[PDB]
Enzyme design. Structure first.
Site, short mmCIF file in Angstrom:
data_model
loop_
_atom_site.label_atom_id
_atom_site.label_comp_id
_atom_site.label_asym_id
_atom_site.label_seq_id
_atom_site.Cartn_x
_atom_site.Cartn_y
_atom_site.Cartn_z
N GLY I 29 0.72 -1.39 -0.08
CA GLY I 29 -0.02 0.04 -0.13
C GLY I 29 0.67 1.26 -0.04
O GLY I 29 2.05 1.21 -0.03
N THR I 30 0.04 2.46 -0.05
CA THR I 30 0.76 3.75 -0.01
C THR I 30 1.29 4.07 1.32
O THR I 30 1.06 3.37 2.33
CB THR I 30 -0.11 4.92 -0.56
OG1 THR I 30 -1.17 4.89 0.37
CG2 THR I 30 -0.64 4.67 -1.94
N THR I 31 2.05 4.89 1.38
CA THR I 31 2.74 5.40 2.67
C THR I 31 2.29 6.31 3.61
O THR I 31 1.16 7.18 2.88
CB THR I 31 4.23 6.28 2.53
OG1 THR I 31 4.89 5.43 1.38
CG2 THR I 31 5.01 6.56 3.75
N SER I 74 -2.63 2.14 5.81
CA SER I 74 -1.86 1.40 4.67
C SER I 74 -2.40 0.13 4.29
O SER I 74 -2.48 -0.84 5.32
CB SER I 74 -0.55 1.70 4.51
OG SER I 74 -0.08 3.08 4.71
#
Ligand SMILES: [Cl-]
Lengths: 235, 244, 111, 195, 241, 240, 250, 231, 243
Positions: I29-31, I74
């Site tokens: 996932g994204t930060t 995330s």
């Protein structure tokens, strides 16, 4: 083993796709819609000559203005028919009117995907639902165990379906009479059936606005078969 | 999920057999032999205890022969713990019938009820079947003296003479040879013990390795008496018949 | 003891013409000897060329009208935007009312 | 409903039941048969609250007929009466009890004896030589106490029954429109068409 | 080989899921020790804060179950907190129903019974934790009772849990062989904590700062945990003799 | 509750559990049904592997559902009892509410519906039973004979057989049974039914059971001697 | 969630074996030896207190348990399974008997209830069998003294004397030679100590052995006076000292 | 492979294959386009037929006077989800006298689809939805995936060959957003967008399906000769 | 083998492989980050702009619980939403019974026990999210991070997602260089920088910055989103630092 409601890598429900294979093994059923009425015809396919063929009930009344033909595991259709009849009568009770053919079909198709681990598997039968209402006129629907239903001008289901559908492709036009439709069902049934078509191993029915849904007598169908033979020999 | 670990106890084989019922019958075939013989004036129930010990308290022991009511008794072949579950249910059913109709339960009705319970475990619920076969010995005023058997499938049948458990094939052949319709209880007692004595896997048939019972009209006037034999009484009948 | 019913007064009137229909009602709303409002609408347009009023206990009246308006909406969803005829609306309202047969909507309804 | 009578004689049981059905100030019917055949040799008459009577009688009938088919055997009158009593004893502590009183007249083919059982809506069972429910017994028991002999014939039983009905027609305020009489014996159940 | 996935018997009569739950116990790589004094019960445990981004005050494997009962856990923190929450609820319910404080041994038995159920029922997994309960019981006095994933439990004179439990266990065994008594003969709990830390140092062979240890103390009518400064005072006293 | 889907579709569009239930019927003792002009006869096979049996008390193969309808079967014996019990309950329920006994078609439709339900319900297997249901509708003199099977499909038959070696006896019936002129009398119908079983049975002693059902709740089971007379007459004519 | 294991985990194999029960019996075989001997005027049950650690207080772990005032129990196999069975056994003695008849159940019927619970764990959904074999000793007025064994299957048998667990085969042979129908309680205790010494490796004393008897009524252990018909429990657990006294005359 | 038997099983790389297989059912479905301006929001859907005798499967469903969606994939699943939206819109109106926000409608669909991806026995929904609506914060367009992921967009397309229409809208972004107070021109842009996803077949009178909602425009669906204007 | 095919099964190691596989979804996932400051907390997240067609500032990722707790995560976004819905139910029932708003440590355990419960059975899947959350209560500011196993701790700074290593390194510098503490307005600026620095791991597509904060002085202890000038100020500060 594996889930009953499992998706395949192609994005299809295994059980639904497998039930469609069972329907392909079923006896042929054909429906043709016209401006003068909708005709429903079926192959009875008795397993033995001792079996009294008139007891084979593959064409069924749902209401006065809606009829139904089946193909596949025909035992599975009984609870579907019971639901359809109840839905039709219940709507008349609640609204003092006939129920739309599409609405009736939608109600039947809502049962289809109610399976899991509710019933343990999908239905193994396809239905041709034919009827008439004041809004959309004469209609023919094909109800599958996927929960999907398509409206059709003409449709064949069962073992000789793709061969019959190709024949319906060429023959159907928007100005067909009821008599022309009756003969056309008999013609295509005779083509795809294993045994020779007669009044005892094939059944006709229709739905008109005036007289409602009627299953044809064996005497009435026999005349239409004789009328068919003569007109094919005419050229 | 949980599906992974399900054995599926209530399914057909490709041949149309119920796996678990068949395997339960295989289990019962290793159980101590039980024999039932029906006569004109009574019924005999004989059964062999499995490889006992000298330190087993026999006079207070009961693994084969059980009382369902005053008129009906059963001989057990299979898992004793499974049998006791069913026996207690059968005892309750008999009492329910007596409370409802104010009459003792007919033998077949009791047998059918227990047999239906066994059937249920083979068709639904996903549980293993009861690994038990019963020989029912009973009396009522409709059919008189009756012998039945039931097995894990829930199927039951009536008999003149029958065996369950180990060596039934050999036992049934011997019974079929010496049994006659005009036979009496005293003769049936002898036949039962002689059949066990020949079919037994043990070296010799002794009083401590047996359970025995009779259902006689040999009770003072028109009534039926159940007799569960005591160790000393089994020892005496073994000497009388000339086995020991 | 708690009394779940009340009386909000008012009066309504429906007259059917040859090619028209009227549904009238006063706009007064009351409890006992007091006026709650001099203008509280009582006759409602429910769609599909149907007008409705449920006179008596206003809370039940509002509840019923609200549920019928809802029934019209779902009739369109379930039956391909078909127009609900006055006879069909009337039968539907019977079932709404009889559904609470043992704890009634305390109203006199006219459509 | 109103009057139901029963008498057990030497070789049969006779049940007599009124024909009137009254609601309010009107006799709606004067030919009502207040009885059901439970089995070929067992008859049950009934009286109590409207609706409950027939509903209960037909429910019992269905259960005994089911037993008969399952076992291919007719239950004894004693067994049927015990089943009926348990249903009423169960019923009296229900949300809405069956408000029904019954007489069960049967011929036991095993013992070759007629048997009459009186059971009220509470589940109170008694075996009797003669019985009645409601205000009927207030008149008929004194007559039966005097005349009844246990070795009477069926014809003598009917004559004694006529004397009961005559007394009821004289002293009871309600016009019960006569009675339907049925006889239960070794040959089964039959109706006396002239009474 | 599905007999290794759920809690059913293997052919050897073993429960592999229970055995593997025992192995999860050492996943944290922490060692704990519990000892009894005259008037007190002391429990110590290693504290390891590897990440600098962590708030070290929230990193704990010692729990205050009730006013009287304390619990140290050997195993992953999710299962530890699962067990802690249940023990707190059980202890509170016990007091409400029976009108007195739940004893340490009774709570241990209750939690051990719950663990037993997970070894017998298939749908529930065992918790991968060992629970060491401590208190000063009003009847039995200083008490140490320990529970494991098999549903086993027993009282202890002293105990140790973790990867290097055996080294600590033998160290404690040898001390009680000399003294020939079932406890640390000491008046104040402060000196009992000093004993506990000293013998852990000797057994493990490592020195400790104030932030390397975690201490819980049970006295009559209360259980409490020591702060970093309280432990520092304890470490100073050990070094000065 | 146990909710496992046991009856499911396979890639080729088959429900194996229903098909394996038919194999259990194939294993079962042979049962035959023949309807005459004014009667129906139900013939049943008794395997002679089981002697020392008590024929008084042993469950008979033909079961009365009501006074005017009967049911025989092939397949699992224990399973058949459950269908018979349900059928008997429904028969009394119909009399109670409709105030008229069931038609043979209605009773068949009910039993068939129960069988179907067990092919798409969770946690249950199909019945390993096919039935022959025969009788006469109330106040009707037209003979009725129906068949059901594990899948739940049912149909009417002029004559039909089920169970082991049913292929052989069906072969016999197909050539010997004439629709234009069925067995006019009880004798002719019973004779044809016994003949059809003699193609398969082995010995004509206690291996053949016959039950005759006539209009107006007239049902009777033939004895050993009565059947033995048919067996004697058939073979004496055959010696020619 | 929901317990979705509604199916049996114990099933019949092709050979007719119930695998999980056999495997449960194997777990019992690995368990520490326990035994029971019946005398004319009493019964004795005994086992080894196999301490898992010397730091552990073995007094807190009770292998021999009171079920009723006149009935006791000991086991071989999985200790936790035994502990919960004792809890259920104590409760069922009240719910299914004492709260109905106003008296404690006779030995055989309590055994029957325990046996039922163990049978259900062999057939019910989503459970394994209990991995223990029990020895239940008890007394009641009409049956006198009795001793019963209960296995993982739920099967139970009455014994004059027997042994279960690790060295049961050798222990049963030892008991066959020594047992007779004229044994007094003290003689049975003596034989119990002799038999148990053979299966024990390490220390053999009152602190490593657990032993209880079903014998005479103990009015001193009742806790109250004033009711003649209440004479006290027949179950008594022997102390560490009482065991050591009999080890000197061994 | 071994981790695609049910929805309750992660793969070793942290993937949910049953959800991905459900996503695949959308790609097989017929193309549908969604786009909006500041005043109006438009749905354009290419309907699919079984054969020449059959009807063209309906793609667009009305949820309220101010909200509706178009579907791609399993149609029965779209019926279940649209029915749920109808109820939620209706609950908001009856209880709060409040038209349901399009953003909140997306949140409700996300959460409903999510429960089917984490529980044993059930299955993910096999359909993708494009929801349009006009609420108190103007025109909106949402894209629903049965993984649970819902995204608010200016324009988008889902189904077979949807990448072509999506690229066109990405170029036209600055133009069609400015089409305010002109419904016909906004539909034109939608019809021109869906045309980029066509191969072999073209837009006929019973093939095309259009829907629109806006400032003073209730959610209305156009089919048959009503869309001949835009062909 | 086969131990990784079913949730709640211990491998011979004593590991639950299904939970470890859920971590892989989180790592994909994204930060997202969290920073504990003097009198509150700051949350920030990376929103990948997949297309120009995404409406800016509309697809909000950070979620509020009650009025004082902020939540960001995330991994699988729907799983995070499910967890926040539960958190809101937990917070509501706490406030209903006890009147006071739920304390952050109390709230942390409610989520922890719920996530942990999804590692106990094979009939459920573990959560495919690591959740960073916190806020201000009576005892002051608190920051937490919760993993798929149900494991959570208190943090001075927290980071998860694809750029967690880069972020963690940056957070560690702040802890060392600011022992006396960091202000709320500083934390917002630093949060912006760290997300921009962590974006090097997702450098293919451009992104949108989203920040929120709870602070006793700046927001009266209530959760609020950073908007307008204060957001742009943080973006400018972040853009200046990367160049
Ligand atoms: Cl407990």
């Amino acid at each position: 083993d594996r889930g009953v409601s499992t998706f395949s890598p192609e994005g299809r429900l295994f059980q639904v796709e497998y039930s469609l294979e069972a329907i392909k093994l079923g006896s042929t059923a054909i429906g043709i819609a016209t401006k003068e009425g909708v005709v429903l015809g079926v192959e009875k396919r008795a397993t033995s000559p001792l079996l009294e063929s008139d007891s084979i009930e593959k064409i069924v009344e749902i209401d006065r203005h809606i009829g139904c033909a089946m193909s596949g595991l025909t035992a599975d259709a009984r609870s579907m028919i019971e639901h359809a009849r109840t839905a039709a009568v219940t709507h008349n009770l609640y609204y003092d009117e006939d129920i739309n053919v599409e609405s009736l079909t939608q109600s039947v198709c809502d049962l289809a995907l109610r399976f899991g681990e509710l019933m343990s598997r999908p239905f193994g039968v396809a239905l041709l639902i034919a009827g008439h209402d004041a809004d959309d006129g004469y209609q023919l629907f094909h109800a599958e165990p996927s929960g999907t239903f398509y409206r059709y001008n003409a449709k064949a289901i069962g073992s000789g379906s793709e061969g019959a559908q190709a024949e319906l492709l060429n023959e159907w036009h928007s100005s067909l009479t009821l008599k022309e439709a009756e003969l056309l069902v008999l013609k295509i049934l005779k083509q795809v059936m294993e045994e020779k078509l007669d009044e005892n191993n094939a059944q006709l029915s229709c739905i008109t606005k005036q007289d409602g849904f009627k299953i044809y007598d064996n005497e009435k169908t026999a005349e239409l078969i004789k009328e068919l033979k003569e007109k094919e020999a005419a050229e | 999920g949980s599906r992974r670990y399900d054995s599926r106890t209530t399914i057909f084989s490709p041949e149309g057999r119920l796996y678990q019922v068949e395997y339960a019958l295989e289990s019962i075939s290793h159980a101590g032999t039980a024999i039932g013989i029906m006569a004109s004036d009574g019924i005999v129930l004989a059964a062999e205890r499995k490889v006992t010990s000298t330190l087993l308290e026999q006079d207070t022991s009961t693994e084969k022969l059980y009382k369902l009511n005053d008129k009906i008794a059963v001989a057990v072949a299979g898992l004793t713990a499974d049998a006791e579950i069913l026996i207690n249910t059968a005892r309750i059913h008999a009492q329910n019938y007596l409370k409802t109709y104010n009459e003792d339960i007919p033998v077949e009705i009791l047998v059918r009820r227990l047999s239906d319970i066994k059937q249920g475990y083979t068709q639904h619920g996903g549980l293993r079947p009861f690994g038990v076969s019963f020989i029912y010995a009973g009396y009522d005023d409709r059919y008189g003296y009756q012998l039945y058997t039931s097995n894990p499938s829930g199927n039951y049948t009536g008999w003149k003479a029958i065996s369950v458990g180990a060596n039934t094939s050999a036992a049934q052949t011997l019974l079929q040879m010496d049994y006659k319709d005009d036979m009496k209880v005293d003769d049936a007692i002898e036949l039962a013990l002689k059949t066990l004595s020949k079919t037994t896997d043990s070296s010799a048939l002794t009083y401590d390795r047996l359970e025995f019972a009779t259902i006689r009209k040999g009770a003072n006037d028109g009534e039926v008496y159940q007799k569960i034999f005591k160790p000393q009484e089994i020892k005496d009948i073994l000497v009388k018949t000339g086995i020991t | 003891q708690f009394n779940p019913y009340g009386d909000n007064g008012g009066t309504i009137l429906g007259i059917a013409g040859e090619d028209f229909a009227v549904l009238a009602g006063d706009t007064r709303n009351i409890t006992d000897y007091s006026i709650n409002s001099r203008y509280e609408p009582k006759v409602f347009d429910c769609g599909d060329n149907i007008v409705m009023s449920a006179n008596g206990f206003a809370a039940d009246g509002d509840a019923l009208v609200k549920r019928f308006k809802n029934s019209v909406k779902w009739y369109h969803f379930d039956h391909n935007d078909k127009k609900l005829s006055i006879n069909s609306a009337a039968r539907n309202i019977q079932h709404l009312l009889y559904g609470k047969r043992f704890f009634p909507y305390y109203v006199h309804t006219i459509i | 409903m109103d009057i139901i009578l029963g008498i057990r004689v030497q070789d049969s049981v006779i049940l007599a039941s009124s024909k009137a059905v009254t609601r309010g100030i009107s006799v709606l019917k004067d030919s009502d048969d207040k009885t059901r055949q439970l089995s070929p040799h067992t008859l049950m008459s009934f009286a109590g609250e409207a609706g409950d009577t027939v509903q209960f009688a037909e429910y019992i009938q269905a259960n005994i007929q089911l037993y008969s088919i399952r076992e291919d055997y007719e239950l004894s009158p004693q067994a049927v009466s015990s089943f009926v009593r348990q249903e009423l004893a169960k019923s009296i502590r229900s949300r809405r009890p069956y408000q029904v009183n019954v007489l069960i007249g049967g011929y036991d083919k095993k013992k070759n004896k007629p048997e009459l059982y009186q059971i009220d809506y509470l589940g109170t069972k008694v075996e009797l030589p003669y019985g009645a429910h409601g205000y009927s017994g207030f008149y008929t028991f004194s007559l039966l106490d005097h005349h009844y002999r246990p070795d009477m014939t069926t014809e003598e039983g009917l004559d004694l029954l006529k004397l009961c009905v005559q007394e009821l027609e004289k002293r009871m305020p309600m016009d019960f429109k006569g009675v339907i009489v049925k006889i239960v014996d070794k040959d089964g159940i039959r109706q006396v068409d002239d009474f | 080989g599905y007999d290794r996935h759920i809690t059913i018997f293997s052919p050897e009569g073993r429960l592999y899921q229970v055995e593997y739950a025992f192995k999860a116990t050492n996943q944290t790589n922490i060692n704990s020790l519990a000892v009894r004094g005259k008037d007190c019960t002391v429990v110590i445990s290693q504290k390891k804060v590897p990440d600098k981004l962590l708030d070290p005050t929230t990193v704990s494997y010692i729990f205050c179950i009730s006013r009287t009962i304390g619990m140290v856990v050997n195993g992953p923190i999710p299962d530890a907190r699962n067990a802690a929450l249940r023990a707190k609820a059980e202890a509170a319910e016990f007091r409400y129903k029976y009108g007195y404080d739940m004893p340490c041994d009774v709570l241990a038995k209750r939690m051990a019974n719950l663990s037993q159920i997970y070894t017998q029922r298939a749908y529930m997994r065992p918790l991968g934790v060992i629970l060491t309960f401590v208190s000063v019981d009003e009847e039995l006095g200083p008490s140490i009772y320990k529970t494991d994933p098999a549903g086993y439990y027993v009282g202890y004179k002293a105990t140790a849990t973790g990867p290097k439990q055996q080294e600590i266990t033998t160290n404690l065994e040898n001390h009680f062989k000399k003294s020939k008594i079932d406890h640390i003969n000491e008046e104040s709990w402060e000196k009992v904590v000093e004993f506990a830390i000293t013998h852990m140092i000797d057994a493990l062979g490592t020195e400790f700062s104030k932030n390397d240890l975690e201490v819980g103390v049970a006295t009559k009518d209360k259980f409490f945990t020591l702060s970093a400064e309280n432990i520092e005072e304890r470490l100073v006293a050990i070094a000065e003799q | 509750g146990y909710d496992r889907a046991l009856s499911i579709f396979s890639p080729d569009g088959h429900i194996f559990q229903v098909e394996y239930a038919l194999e259990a019927v194939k294993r079962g003792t042979c049962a035959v049904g023949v309807k005459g002009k004014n009667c129906v006869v139900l013939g049943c096979e008794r395997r002679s592997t089981l002697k020392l049996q008590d024929t008084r008390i042993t469950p008979s193969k033909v079961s009365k559902i009501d006074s005017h309808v009967v049911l025989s079967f092939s397949g699992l014996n224990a399973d058949s009892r459950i269908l018979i019990e349900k059928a008997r309950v429904e028969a009394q329920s119909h009399r109670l509410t409709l105030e008229d006994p069931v038609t043979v078609e209605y009773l068949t439709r009910y039993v068939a519906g129960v069988q179907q339900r067990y092919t798409q319900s969770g946690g249950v297997r199909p019945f390993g039973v096919s039935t022959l249901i025969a009788g006469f509708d109330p106040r009707d003199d037209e003979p009725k004979l129906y068949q059901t099977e594990p899948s739940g499909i049912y149909s009417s038959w002029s004559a039909q057989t089920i169970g082991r070696n049913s292929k052989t006896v069906r072969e016999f019936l197909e050539k010997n049974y004439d629709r234009k002129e069925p067995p006019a009398t009880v004798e002719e119908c019973v004779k044809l039914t016994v003949r059809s079983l003699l193609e398969v049975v082995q010995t004509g002693a206690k291996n053949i059971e016959i039950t005759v059902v006539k209009p107006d709740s007239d049902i009777v089971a033939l004895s050993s001697e009565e059947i033995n007379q048919y067996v004697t007459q058939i073979e004496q004519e055959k010696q020619e | 969630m929901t317990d979705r294991y509604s199916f049996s985990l114990t099933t019949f194999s092709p050979s007719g074996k119930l695998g999980q029960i056999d495997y449960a019996l194997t777990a019992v075989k690995q368990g520490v030896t326990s035994l029971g001997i019946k005398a004319t005027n009493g019964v004795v049950i005994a086992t080894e207190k196999k301490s898992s650690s010397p730091l552990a207080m073995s007094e807190t772990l009770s292998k021999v348990s009171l079920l009723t005032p006149d009935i006791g129990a000991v086991y071989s196999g999985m200790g936790p399974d035994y502990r919960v069975l004792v809890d259920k056994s104590r409760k069922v003695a009240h719910t299914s008997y004492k709260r109905i008849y106003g008296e404690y159940p006779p030995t055989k019927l309590l055994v029957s209830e325990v046996a039922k619970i163990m049978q259900e764990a062999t057939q019910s959904g989503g459970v394994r069998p209990f991995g223990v074999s029990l020895l239940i000793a008890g007394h009641d007025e009409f049956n006198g003294f009795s001793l019963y064994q209960v296995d993982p299957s739920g099967s139970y048998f009455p014994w004059k004397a027997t042994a279960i667990g690790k060295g049961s085969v050798a222990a049963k042979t030892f008991l066959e030679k020594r047992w007779n129908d004229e044994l007094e309680l003290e003689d049975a205790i003596h034989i119990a100590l002799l038999t148990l010494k053979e299966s024990v490796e390490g220390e053999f004393n009152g602190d490593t052995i657990e032993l209880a008897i079903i014998g005479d009524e103990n009015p001193d252990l009742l806790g109250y006076t004033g009711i003649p018909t209440d004479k006290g429990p027949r179950f008594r657990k022997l102390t560490s000292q009482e065991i050591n006294d009999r080890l000197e005359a061994l | 492979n071994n981790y695609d038997g049910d929805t309750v099983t992660f793969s070793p790389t942290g993937r949910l294959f049953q959800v991905e297989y459900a996503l695949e059912a959308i790609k097989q479905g017929s193309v549908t386009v969604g786009l909006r301006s500041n005043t109006h929001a438009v749905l354009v859907a290419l309907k699919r037929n079984a054969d020449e005798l059959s009807s063209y499967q309906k793609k667009i469903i009305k949820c309220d006077e101010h909200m509706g969606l178009s579907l791609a994939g399993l149609a029965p699943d779209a019926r279940v989800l649209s029915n749920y939206l109808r109820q939620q819109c209706n609950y908001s109106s009856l209880v709060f006298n409040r038209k349901l926000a399009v953003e909140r409608a997306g949140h409700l669909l996300c959460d409903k689809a999510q429960k089917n991806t984490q529980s044993y026995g059930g299955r993910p929904y096999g359909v993708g939805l494009l929801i349009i609506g006009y609420d108190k914060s103007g025109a909106h367009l949402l894209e629903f995936q049965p993984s649970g992921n819902v995204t608010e967009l200016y324009g988008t397309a889902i189904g077979a060959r949807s990448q072509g229409a999506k690229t066109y809208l990405e170029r036209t972004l600055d133009t069609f957003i400015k089409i305010d107070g002109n419904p016909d021109e906004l539909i034109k842009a939608g019809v021109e967008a869906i045309s980029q996803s066509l191969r072999d077949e073209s837009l006929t009178v019973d093939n095309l399906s259009i829907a629109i909602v806006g400032k003073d425009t209730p959610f209305t669906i156009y089919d048959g000769e009503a869309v001949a204007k835009y062909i | 083998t086969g131990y990784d095919l079913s949730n709640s099964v211990f491998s011979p190691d004593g590991r639950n492989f299904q939970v470890e596989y859920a971590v892989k979804a989180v790592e994909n996932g994204t930060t997202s980050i969290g920073i504990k400051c003097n009198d509150g907390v700051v949350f920030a997240v990376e929103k990948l702009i997949t297309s120009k067609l995404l409406v800016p500032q509309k697809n909000v990722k950070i979620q509020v619980v009650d009025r004082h707790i902020g939540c960001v995560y995330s991994g699988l976004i729907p799983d995070g939403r499910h967890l926040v819905n539960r958190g809101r139910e937990e917070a509501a029932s706490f406030k209903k019974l006890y009147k006071t708003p739920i304390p952050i440590p109390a709230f942390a355990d409610r989520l922890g026990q719920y996530v942990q419960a999804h590692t106990l059975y094979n009939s459920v899947r573990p959560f495919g999210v690591s959740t960073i959350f916190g806020g201000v209560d009576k005892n002051g500011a608190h920051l937490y991070m919760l993993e798929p196993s149900g494991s959570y701790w208190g943090y001075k700074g927290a980071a998860t997602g694809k750029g967690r290593q880069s972020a963690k390194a940056e957070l560690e510098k702040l802890v060392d260089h600011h022992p006396e503490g960091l202000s709320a307005r500083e934390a917002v600026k630093q949060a912006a920088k760290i997300i921009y620095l962590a974006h090097e791991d997702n450098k293919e597509k451009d992104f949108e910055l989203e920040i929120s904060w709870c602070s006793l002085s700046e927001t009266n202890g209530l959760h609020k989103f950073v908007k307008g000038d204060l957001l742009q100020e943080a973006i400018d500060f972040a853009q200046k630092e990367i160049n």
